[PDB]
Design a protein around this nucleic acid. Structure first.
Ligand SMILES: CC(=O)O[C@H]1[C@H](C)[C@H](O)[C@H](C)[C@@H](O)[C@@H]([C@H](C)OC(=O)C(C)(C)CC(=O)O)CC/C=C(/C)C(=O)Nc2cc(O)c3c4c(c(C)c(O)c3c2O)O[C@](C)(O/C=C/[C@H](O[C@H]2C[C@@H]3OCO[C@@H]3[C@@H](C)O2)[C@H]1C)C4=O
Ligand SMILES: [Zn+2]
Lengths: 85, 73, 157, 116, 89, 297, 211, 72
DNA sequence: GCTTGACAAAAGTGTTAAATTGTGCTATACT
DNA sequence: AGCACAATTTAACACTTTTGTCAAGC
């Protein structure tokens, strides 16, 4: 049995060959020698991703100021630059 | 001829353990408000007990006794 | 392993030569789990890159006998082979910013210093971020605008 | 005096070997190996004995596959095989590669060979 | 005493902001925990625990203080040790 | 010296009063909302006055200047907190950089409406960022921060009882005081152990480490003699009998096979293989057949 | 180095005119050895700045459990850990949009970790571990520096060897030496085992070993 | 190993785990056993963390004077 | 020499309930 | 320091498939 070959492609364009699992399944993504995630060319995507949004600076501001308090501050600034003119 | 005798060179190592212990009693007494402070709670004796524990174990002067005959020891 | 070779030659190892040697990039400053005492993935000692700890056995254990050799594990990513490869395989670390090789900077004589004509005391202030160095300058724009800039400079002065 | 024959006599045919360096290891409870220094290597070269020096430094000390096949040949009574590459030298090449020095052992042809 | 001389020269430790009475005096000893045969057999150290007896006045413990035997030796972790004398200028 | 260069450069930035801290805090929050507003309107299909939209994009530029200016002013506060944690297993610079990471979050979460001085709220994040870093980095074998808490907590309980009793507490008393099992604290004390250097000192330590995995030279010869010996003992078996014992123990391909697998190649029931095995095993146990295999053990 | 002409910088260094009777010409001559060295071969001078750092195999920087339950490890693991820790934090700073003071400070710390990894202590104080002992870098490993220097004058330990105390052998011939029976027994152990198996004293080689 | 399991199954021995780890006498020494001190886990004694049992064996040797010994 | 169905043990597999691990956070002022 | 919470790993118990086994029959 022991022969099965699959190729993965990284984001920078390099190609990698991983022989494995003649009798079993094949992953869709693989951590390669390049240190980057690979993607199989044949045998489609079949894996989803959770893709949680990284908590940003906007998330920490919006959870203290309400959108009305920000709008009033933005008017205080915009009216201030109008005074410069 | 200084001739550091055992007890006198023992005392010198206790100085470092006590002095480095007093450096902590200066700093850690300030952060906490008063009347919650006593020489007991703030003093961590680790540097004192570590110095004497670090002396016999690591000092070149503290030697494994040599006795294959009474004269050697 | 012919025991007879004619020449032995060296040379500067480029970043590509380093990427070619490595079997993978070690991404974490981890050595081994504190409970299982086994190599942590993506860190140092990682079997997925350096090699398997036990002969002809992967990390998860779905391939144990010698029947499977020259293959990798789909679940853990460990190539099944002799454990001696842990001694023969290297990794690499991709740098977020370039770095100088200390042998060609602090050497006596300084190889970079004699190559770019930078005094060793001046070169130490560059790579250690103690001074700025001009990389490029635009000659045409400076020569064409030199007139107006001298005027504005003397006016401010 | 405390120096006694029972404590100072040592003999070793085969025994354990160190982990990092594959050389034998003396100073444990059993079967300490004797050290062959460069001064002894200088005397061995002065005599012009090339094989004796090669046997000590490759198959008696550092050959991973050497010292096992010699013990095998000696037991069967066959000729002793030709030594291999000492592990000390293979470790030397990796130490150079980790220093960002690209070393390559080139034969007369087949440009570069990899130890493995 | 040696410990008293060391404790007296440091006593009191005065904080710069406000005064603190940390003066130490009259250190206390306890009878040696175990005999030299017990310490050498059980691999422990021959020591007598010492606690300083001195602005709150709460007596504090310090740690196991090793002791010298009649032969002039110390048992440290079950091993009989001798502290050589040093000669400096 | 490296650390001297960092202190000289940060000492240039002038410290700020209370009024400068609030103004910069406003410009940052104005810059953030302006940046988010411009991005949300294209999603919702809206347009704004050309001149005023331009002004918002200048609020974005100016917001970042306030952000960097606020960080550079308090870079002295990070060092002042990082001086106390030196010598505990992390380099000073690493404590400063990990402190700067906490400072960055202090600026992102600061609230100027509360009227508190900035150094009050910044010390929390800067001090926690250093400690949290030590739990993740200092040890060669990393330990989760939650275990670093109980390790440090048990050390405090141990240090408090050492003073309380006059003797070092036993596992039972240390556990009773900490409300855990007595054998649990033993496992904790194993985790808190830190490694020793193989390169420390006449000869280095690593030179005395045995290689336990490498098998002895005599056995590699005896195993081959045992292999050749079993080869001859398989000749007296039937052709299929040899094949069954081989496949059963995986002598040929290295992996044992189940009775079902074995029968599949020969085309018989898995029970039939169990029957053939019993006969070959008893036939192998015959004295004439197994006489030689006794010495090999 | 990217925009740099070796040949054009060599022709400028080829001039022996411009009087240069003193050190002015020898400076150009001494440095020309490093400038002409790159021109002759096909090596790129870019090799002096690393974009990637190679990692030595683990078996050469092992971490194994010592006697009595203690742990032991090489210094390279901590020196490699020093590099990968700061390289990663630099990635966090870049993605955070941090000021240049913090970013450039981290780049300098990253530069010093690789310096300590290759040759520790060559510049500035070396990285010290427990007890204030300088960590052993790759250069210390290659030179064979244990305390100060052991430049392979220890050679390597060999099998089939032994030693003992010597006594006078006045009855010996010049070509003879008195050998203790036990020392000669263990020394020739593989040989006697063979001849012992050649005869019927021991059935197999495993039995002759115990004999 | 596969070759070892066969002999194990033939003669009835089993792959009872195990790796033999015994305190043998060092090569080149002999004598009589004078005393043994054993520290077990059942009894409450003091020992390092995790180590259940500790036993120390004392062996004595009556050394005759022999050629090669150093006198002075 | 071979298969059947029973029965069991053992080996897996999917669905849950602890636990383990990681990240965020703490507001007198503190440079 | 300590706690809250989310995310991930672990161990559970479970119900099903696989594997070894006995007795009876072809
Ligand atoms: C394990 C140990 O403790 O060894 C001890 C010491 C040797 C033992 O007491 C030993 C039992 C010894 O008493 C007997 C022994 C039979 O003698 C011999 O070994 C020979 C073979 C040479 C004599 C012979 O047969 O000819 C007989 C000795 C009789 C004589 C005239 C003698 O030797 N004098 C002598 C010899 C020394 O070299 C040193 C020495 C030293 C200091 C501060 C000394 O005063 C020394 C000293 O007076 O500094 C150095 C660099 O290093 C220090 C290393 C050690 O000290 C430890 C102390 C701590 O213990 C654990 O952590 C520390 C460790 C790191 O260092 C030394 C002080 C060092 O070389
Ligand atoms: Zn696996």
């Amino acid at each position: 049995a022991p022969r099965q070959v699959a190729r993965y492609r990284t984001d920078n364009g390099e190609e990698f060959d991983v022989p494995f699992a003649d009798d079993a399944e094949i992953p869709g993504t693989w951590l390669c020698r390049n240190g980057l995630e690979g993607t199989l060319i044949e045998g489609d995507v079949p894996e989803p991703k959770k893709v949680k949004p990284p908590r940003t600076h906007w998330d920490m501001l919006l959870e203290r100021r309400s959108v009305e308090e920000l709008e009033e501050l933005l008017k205080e600034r915009l009216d201030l630059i109008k005074a410069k003119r | 001829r200084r001739l550091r005798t055992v007890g006198e060179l023992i005392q010198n190592q206790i100085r470092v353990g006590l002095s480095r212990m007093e450096r902590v009693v200066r700093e850690r007494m300030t952060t906490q408000d008063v009347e919650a402070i006593t020489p007991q709670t703030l003093i961590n004796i680790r540097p004192v007990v570590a110095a004497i524990k670090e002396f016999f174990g690591t000092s070149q002067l503290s030697q494994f006794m040599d006795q294959n005959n009474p004269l050697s020891g | 392993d012919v025991n007879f070779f004619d020449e032995l030659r060296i040379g500067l190892a480029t970043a590509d030569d380093i990427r070619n040697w490595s079997y993978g990039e070690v991404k974490k400053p981890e050595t081994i789990n504190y409970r299982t005492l086994k190599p942590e993935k993506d860190g140092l000692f990682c079997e997925k890159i350096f090699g398997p700890t036990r002969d002809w056995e992967c990390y998860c254990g779905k391939y144990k006998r010698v029947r499977f050799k020259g293959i990798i594990c789909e679940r853990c990513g460990v190539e099944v082979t002799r454990a001696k490869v842990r001694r023969e395989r290297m990794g690499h670390i991709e740098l977020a910013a370039p770095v100088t090789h200390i042998w060609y900077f602090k050497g006596v004589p300084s190889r970079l210093g004699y190559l770019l004509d930078l005094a060793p005391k001046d070169l130490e202030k560059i790579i250690y971020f103690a001074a700025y160095v001009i990389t490029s300058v635009d000659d045409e724009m400076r020569h064409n605008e030199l007139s107006t800039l001298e005027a504005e400079m003397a006016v401010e002065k | 005096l405390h120096h006694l024959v029972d404590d100072k006599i040592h003999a070793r045919s085969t025994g354990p070997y160190s982990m990092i360096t594959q050389q034998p290891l003396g100073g444990k409870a059993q079967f300490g190996g004797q050290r062959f220094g460069e001064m002894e290597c200088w005397a061995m070269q002065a005599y012009g004995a090339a094989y004796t020096l090669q046997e000590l430094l490759t198959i008696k000390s550092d050959d991973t596959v050497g010292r096992v096949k010699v013990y095998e040949a000696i037991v069967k009574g066959e000729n002793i095989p030709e030594p291999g590459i000492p592990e000390s030298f293979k470790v030397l090449l990796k130490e150079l590669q980790s220093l960002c020095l690209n070393v390559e052992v080139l034969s007369s042809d087949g440009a570069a060979i990899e130890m493995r | 005493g040696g410990l008293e001389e060391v404790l007296a020269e440091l006593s009191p430790i005065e904080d710069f902001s406000g005064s603190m009475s940390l003066s130490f005096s009259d250190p206390r000893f306890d009878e040696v925990k175990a005999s030299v045969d017990e310490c050498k057999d059980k691999d422990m150290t021959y020591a007598a625990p010492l606690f300083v007896t001195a602005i709150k006045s709460q007596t504090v413990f310090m740690g196991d203080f090793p002791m010298m035997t009649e032969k002039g030796t110390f048992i440290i972790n079950g091993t009989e040790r001798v502290v050589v004398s040093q000669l400096v200028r | 010296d490296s650390v001297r260069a960092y202190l000289k450069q940060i000492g240039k930035v002038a410290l700020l009063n209370a009024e400068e801290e609030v103004e910069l805090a406003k410009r940052i929050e104005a810059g953030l909302y302006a940046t988010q507003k411009l991005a949300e309107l294209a999603e919702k299909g809206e347009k704004l006055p050309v001149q005023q939209r331009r002004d918002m994009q200048w609020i974005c530029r100016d917001g970042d200047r306030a952000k960097n200016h606020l960080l550079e002013a308090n870079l002295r506060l990070v060092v002042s907190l990082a001086k106390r944690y030196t010598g505990r297993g992390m380099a000073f610079l690493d404590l400063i950089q990990e402190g700067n990471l906490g400072l960055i979050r202090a600026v992102e979460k600061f609230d100027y409406t509360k009227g508190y001085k900035f150094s009050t709220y910044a010390t929390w994040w800067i001090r926690q960022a250093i400690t949290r870093a030590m739990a993740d980095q200092a040890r060669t074998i990393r330990i989760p921060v939650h275990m670093v808490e109980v390790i440090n907590k048990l050390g405090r309980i141990q240090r408090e009882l050492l003073q309380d009793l006059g003797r070092e507490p036993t596992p039972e008393e240390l556990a009773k005081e900490m409300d855990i099992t007595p054998e649990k604290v033993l496992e904790i004390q194993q985790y808190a152990r830190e490694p020793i250097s193989l390169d420390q000192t006449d000869s280095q330590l690593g030179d005395f480490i045995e290689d336990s995995e490498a098998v002895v030279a005599v056995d590699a010869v005896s195993f081959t003699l045992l292999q050749d010996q079993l080869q001859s003992v398989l000749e007296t078996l039937s052709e299929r009998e040899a094949g069954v014992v081989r496949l059963r123990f995986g002598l040929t391909d290295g992996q044992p096979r189940t009775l079902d697998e074995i029968g599949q190649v020969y085309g018989v029931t898995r029970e039939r293989i169990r029957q053939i095995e019993s006969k070959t095993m008893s036939k192998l146990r015959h004295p004439s057949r197994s006489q030689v295999l006794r010495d090999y053990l | 180095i990217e925009n740099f002409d070796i040949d054009a910088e060599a022709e400028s260094l080829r001039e022996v005119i411009r009087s240069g009777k003193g050190q002015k010409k020898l400076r150009a001559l001494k440095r020309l050895k490093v400038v002409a060295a790159f021109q002759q071969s096909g090596n790129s001078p870019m090799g002096m700045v690393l974009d990637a750092v190679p990692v030595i195999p683990p078996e050469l920087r092992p971490m194994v459990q010592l006697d009595g339950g203690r742990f032991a490890t090489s210094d390279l693991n901590d020196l490699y850990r020093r590099v990968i820790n700061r390289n990663n934090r630099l990635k966090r700073l870049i993605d955070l949009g941090a000021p240049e003071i913090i970013v450039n400070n981290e780049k300098r710390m990253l530069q010093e970790s690789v310096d300590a990894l290759f040759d520790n202590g060559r510049r500035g104080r070396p990285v010290t571990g427990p007890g204030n002992r300088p960590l052993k870098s790759l250069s210390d490993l290659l030179k064979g520096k244990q305390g100060r220097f052991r430049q392979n004058l220890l050679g390597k330990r060999v099998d089939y060897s032994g030693r003992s105390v010597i006594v006078v052998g006045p009855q010996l011939k010049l070509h003879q030496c008195g050998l203790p029976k036990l020392m000669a027994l263990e020394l020739f152990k593989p040989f006697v085992m063979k001849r012992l198996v050649d005869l019927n004293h021991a059935q197999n080689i495993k039995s002759a070993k115990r004999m | 190993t596969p070759e070892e399991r066969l002999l194990r199954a033939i003669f009835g021995e089993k792959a009872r785990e195990v790796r033999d780890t015994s305190l043998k006498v060092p090569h080149g020494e002999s004598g009589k056993v004078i005393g043994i001190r054993v520290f077990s886990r059942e009894d409450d004694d003091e020992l390092p963390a995790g180590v259940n049992e500790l036993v120390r064996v004392y062996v004595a040797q009556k050394r005759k004077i022999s050629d090669g010994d150093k006198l002075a």
